[PDB]
Amino acid sequence: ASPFRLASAGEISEVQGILRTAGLLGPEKRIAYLGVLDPARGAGSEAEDRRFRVFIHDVSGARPQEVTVSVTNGTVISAVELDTAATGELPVLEEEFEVVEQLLATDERWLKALAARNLDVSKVRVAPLSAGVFEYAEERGRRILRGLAFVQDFPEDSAWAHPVDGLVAYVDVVSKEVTRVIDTGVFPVPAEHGNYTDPELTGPLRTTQKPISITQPEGPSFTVTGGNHIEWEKWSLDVGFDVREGVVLHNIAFRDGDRLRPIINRASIAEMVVPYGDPSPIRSWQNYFDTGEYLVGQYANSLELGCDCLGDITYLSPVISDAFGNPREIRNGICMHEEDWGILAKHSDLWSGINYTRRNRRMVISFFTTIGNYDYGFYWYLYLDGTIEFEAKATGVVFTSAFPEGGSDNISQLAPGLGAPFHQHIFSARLDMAIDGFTNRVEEEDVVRQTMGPGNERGNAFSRKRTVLTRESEAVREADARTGRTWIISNPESKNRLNEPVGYKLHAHNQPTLLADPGSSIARRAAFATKDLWVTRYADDERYPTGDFVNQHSGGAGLPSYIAQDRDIDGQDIVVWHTFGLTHFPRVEDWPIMPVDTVGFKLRPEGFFDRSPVLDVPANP
Template sequence: MFTVDDLTTALQVTLSDLEFNKSIIARGVDFNDLICAPPSSGWFGADEEGKRIVKVECFSSQNTPNFYMRPIEGLTVTVDVDRKEIVKITDTGRGIPIPKATNTDYRYTSSPFSDMTPLTNPMSMEQPKGPSFTVENGHIVKWANWVFHLKPDIRAGMIISQAKIRAENGEYRSVMYKGFASELFVPYMDPDESWYFKSYMDAGEFGLGATAMALLELNDCPRHAYYMDGVFASADGRPVIQPNMICIFERYSGDIGWRHSEIPVLGFDIRESRPKVTLVARMAASVGNYDYIFDWEFQTDGLIRIKVGLTGMLMVKGTPYENIYNIFNANDMTGTLVSENVIGVVHDHFVSFHLDMDIDGANNSFAKVNLVKENTLPGQSPRRSYLKAKRKVAKTENDAKIKLKLYDPSEFHVFNPSKRSRLGNPTGYKIIPGGNAASLLDLDDPPQIRGAFTNNQIWVTPHNKTEEWAGGLLVSQSKGDDTLAVWSARNREIENKDIVLWYTLGFHHIPCQEDFPVMPTVSSSFELKPVNFFDRNPIMGATPTFQKDLPVCSASRSY
């Protein structure tokens, strides 16, 4: 990862350069309003060999804290941080105006909110007996039938490990040895001189934990949340504390755990329902302009939901256009005009998760369960076709490289071939993809070579303690020679082995006006769900909620 010293050096070298300062003056920017940020440079060939390169780009903060919406377009400084010298200055955008600050301030205390802004009354979940979870020794979380270890991490943000769930006989059974966000790849889709290199590896280059800011009580996390600090070592070895970096809380939003009612005409008067209460571990990383919200949500039925939310600011490009009717050639646009003189450039987000599953022990296998259409025989049935589930166990890594396809419906199981249920089925968990996106870049495009873990949505590898970071251990200016794709190309055996499941969650983002000046959160998720792990529904014995169990509350006004 880049250190604070690296980034500070890049800024100092830039701000002391005469050519750079002349360009800032020529653009009419007051140096008191100048904000410069050092984005990573990626890897684009031999010209960068032997140099530790940082790019520097600048903005104007005049009349707004949201400087990201006021880029100084076309001015990019390439700095060698080891030699403390400028390698190149690109200055091509002097004719492009700096976007105005109007309507860019997003702070509650400063923004003039319209009377038409949607408002709701404040609400919270009350827990008169307090939370149902405990945190022992600062890291061991116990809740309902779950126990797991939770640790802040400077690179991954947070790591869930030793996740176990209690069976009906009281025994705690292993589900996952370790799970975390391994890498976050964000390539922008603009070939211009000041944009082509923008293809960030946010975990490996900046650190999801290093960029995690303190969570805001009642807004980032609800009442009764437990907060955990991150304690990391800085580049010089001194401890750094990230306060309130992770929160843990119980969630109830009116969802149903299970229910069934019988129609009275059949002679049964049955209405049974159980509320769904879950436990969430959350952290948020502010990696420059973007904020990433990571939730690990545990359910009493054994399901784990992993969700990623995107919010914060777009990375925008300055343009002379104020309206789409002024654009002479729409093909030159690499994004949407989201405000006057502001283009929201098309980009992707890919989050690769390292999931070291240990279903009832370390040695597991991976199976793809396909739904296959079968045709009936003549005269066999009024039906012409039906579906059957066909299971294929992966022998090697190549067998487990999965590209998700809507018209090839499948389930993906991690199971223990040596552990059987009461009925003889192998105990397991399945990964259930949610909304997803695949990389469309050429495989030999330099950003895609570095982000080759996005070539598939699912991978399975044998456990190797040196293979934890999907983009490689050392990501800054990496050439893509130490990625998940490189490791998996060895096609090692994975049947009945200590294996790691990898899942890449993707977003294609075509910006729109509603993303300006700060984005509403957009989320996607996937699930890890028991499959023949329990002998029956594990929450059959869940207790319904009765009015007497709840605190007596009254509204502050009548309607």
């Protein structure tokens, strides 16, 4: 069986037993993260050792631990006590969320703030939000959550329509104390509802949409073996799932004649951050590391056939751990299917008389997650021509505030008195490269304009240049859309039939990167988001661009610390980290529920093949 297979319920049960038995899972303990470790470099020819990594919280205040377990052998390999003030706090527990609202509900300062605004405490929902690190000395080493209030008029009401501005609270979810309640002044609570299933708002549902039926009478063209191994139109890969990262692709390879050719060893979205750009002290601390602080995998939706995923769908149902180490299945959490993708190649030739058309298609691997008000879909695409693409789809309900009477340079008006603070959604794709194997390098390619003159008398010439990134200190790069800048990953020791190194070219969307001031806390904690492309030398323990414990960690962790090692990356085992994001100035059309917007990137073969790899695609019926 493959060492890249999905974790089983039984494996999670075994982990639980090992911990309990070792005295590491007492009643005050909680599992904040649990996931299988990938195989070490060079092991496929050694006996498998399924290992799991676990972060263990203690609700009684004791120090948390990082533990590594071997389920194959039934042992604890390592258990280290964590100093959270130094290395960071553990991810937020799903169970700690409800705690903010409950604690506030009996706090005199909070109740006084609600009384001033004539709000029934029973109707006030509180969003349990990550704290970050600012000027509050007493917070260092404490697990803090901050809370913003929203009014829910009735059980099925959308509370996002009714933010309570001018009020914020801080809570210690371990000592269960309210550390601060800040009331900067009363703002009107927006009164219009945002109930998008209410006929009064939707009006009569349209009856004009006729069905579109998408079927595959002989079934799908892909095969799934060993639970999660996919083969499709020359492509080979394994679909992993981790509670923090979500869907992870392993061993992406392409079968070129009689050779299975590696392209990417591991692909994942290794972090994603949502920084807010409203300077009000009510929200100025607001930055959500959806991946690193909340763990997007654990909140993956069950995807419904015909609504979420359309066509001939093959599902995976990944298993994760709950807080106590019990296995929990996410039914139909991953969708797999192939889609038509228009014309692949076409030419009608006058001279030969040959008219030729071929159709394209893509393999899709997706999941969808919900984090409070946001919902994000993560889509990986494999195309017939060798192209690999990622796309994030952002939807959900916008995070809201009051709209100030005088207007705002940092907030949009969505409805009367209803504001939506400006923010970004910024992702980091970690691509552990393996172009024809692990000996890889990256070049930055810019188009080069040429001056009219000798050797270019008509002034029509243009060219391009490539710069090898040889050391990590030179490998922090920025976009330059104006010069058509891309990055090529190649294997200097593997050449195509024209004697050029095989390569793949990364095409970025060139959206803005992190907008915050460089001296800001968020710029330090999300340093990765300040630049478009980073290249590091592969290492076991360098997994996330923000480090292992993002919650309430002071800046510098992750990429900035990795890069500081200044390792050789010229013809070596390397990792590309691409930052890409949406900058969101919410529009009226985003309310009361927002239409999907998208961002992503793709990689196209660049002299990887000896000619088109789709000449053997047959004519369509």
